[PDB]
């Protein structure tokens, strides 16, 4: 039974390796989504400062 339990540990270890990679991959896409979004807001920072520099429509 201990050998069977050791074999079950390998299955859990194999699941652990698969689970760690699967979770990391999902957050990598989300991190890229936020990084892409942070670029959009970063571009909005310049436009907001650009509107101020006009001093006519501002």
């Amino acid at each position: 039974g201990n050998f069977k339990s050791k074999l079950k540990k390998a299955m859990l270890s194999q699941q652990i390796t698969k689970s760690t990679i699967a979770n990391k991959m999902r957050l990598k896409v989300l991190s890229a989504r936020e990084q892409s979004l942070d670029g959009i807001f970063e571009e909005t920072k310049e436009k907001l400062s650009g509107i101020a520099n006009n001093r006519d429509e501002y």
Binding site: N2, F3, K4, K6, L7, A10
Partner: protein, 53 residues
């Protein structure tokens, strides 16, 4: 009596043989350790198969 003392010596020899029976069990306990090792060897073979997988 002398005959009774000799009988007691035979009983003492049987008592020594009774002690030797425990030694015989102790001698058989060496095979028990081998049997226990064989039990672990079977688990080791099962573990080796699990390790291979």
């Amino acid at each position: 009596n002398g005959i009774a003392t000799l009988l007691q010596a035979e009983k003492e020899a049987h008592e020594i043989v009774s002690k030797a029976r425990k030694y015989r069990q102790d001698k058989l306990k060496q095979a028990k350790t081998d049997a226990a090792k064989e039990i672990d060897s079977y688990k080791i073979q099962k573990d080796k198969e699990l390790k291979e997988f």
